[PDB]
């Protein structure tokens, strides 16, 4: 058996168990990925590689993650592009920006990306987002065009409580998001 766990409720100015990329850094006890500025990207990864599956045994891990995030937009009606929780190869660097969320490079399925992500998409990209134009939660598998989505009403400046779990017995990835109001 192999397990990896951690908890952080307040971020230090030098949170050494995290790897930062782009504009990602800690400030005011929070983990900031981007400030309200155009065309940028920020990522933060846990320092330790995580053992998700094993070829010889074919065993796959069960895992769960909890986090609370906030999106602060100057104009509550002009918001982009979104935020994700992702699982990628150990040596991952920021991918395409903008609507690609720094984790994918195309709407076409790309086996080489080897990345799974749960997105909280605040901007409608006509090339691949749900036609109703709603902001949405989505499950992405090697593509920015989600395998499944659910419409989500962004609450500007409100704390979004998220839980994401993976059940290896069923290969089911579940996502939950709650707002206090």
């Amino acid at each position: 058996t192999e397990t990896t766990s951690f908890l952080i409720t307040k971020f230090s100015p030098d949170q050494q168990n995290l790897i930062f990329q782009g504009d990602g850094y800690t400030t005011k006890e929070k983990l900031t990925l981007t400030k309200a500025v155009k065309n940028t990207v920020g990522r933060a990864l846990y320092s330790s590689p995580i053992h998700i599956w094993d070829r010889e045994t074919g065993n796959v891990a069960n895992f769960v993650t909890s986090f609370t995030f906030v999106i602060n937009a100057p104009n509550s009606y002009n918001v982009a592009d979104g935020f994700t929780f992702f699982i990628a190869p150990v040596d991952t660097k920021p991918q395409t920006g903008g609507g690609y969320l720094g984790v994918f490079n195309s709407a076409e399925y790309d086996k080489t990306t080897q990345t799974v992500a749960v997105e909280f998409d605040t901007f409608y990209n006509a090339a691949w987002d749900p036609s109703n134009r709603d902001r949405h939660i989505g499950i992405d598998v090697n593509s920015i065009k989600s395998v499944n989505t659910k419409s989500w009403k962004l609450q500007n400046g409100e704390e979004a409580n998220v839980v994401i779990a993976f059940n290896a017995a069923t290969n089911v990835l579940t996502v939950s998001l709650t707002y206090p109001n």
Binding site: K38, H51, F67, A80, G102
Partner: protein, 48 residues
């Protein structure tokens, strides 16, 4: 309280490598916003 749920079947072993790194990402384009995380926990268990 306002809640949302979403789920799907993802064949993890066929998409990601045996070992991975996990993390968060956020981007802006022509339109923007600040994206922040207040707390984070994680737990994984792989059997032998």
């Amino acid at each position: 309280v306002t809640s949302y749920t979403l789920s799907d079947v993802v064949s993890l072993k066929d998409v990601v490598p045996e070992w991975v790194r996990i993390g968060f990402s956020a981007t802006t384009g022509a339109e923007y916003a600040a994206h922040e995380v207040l707390s984070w926990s994680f737990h994984s268990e792989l059997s032998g």
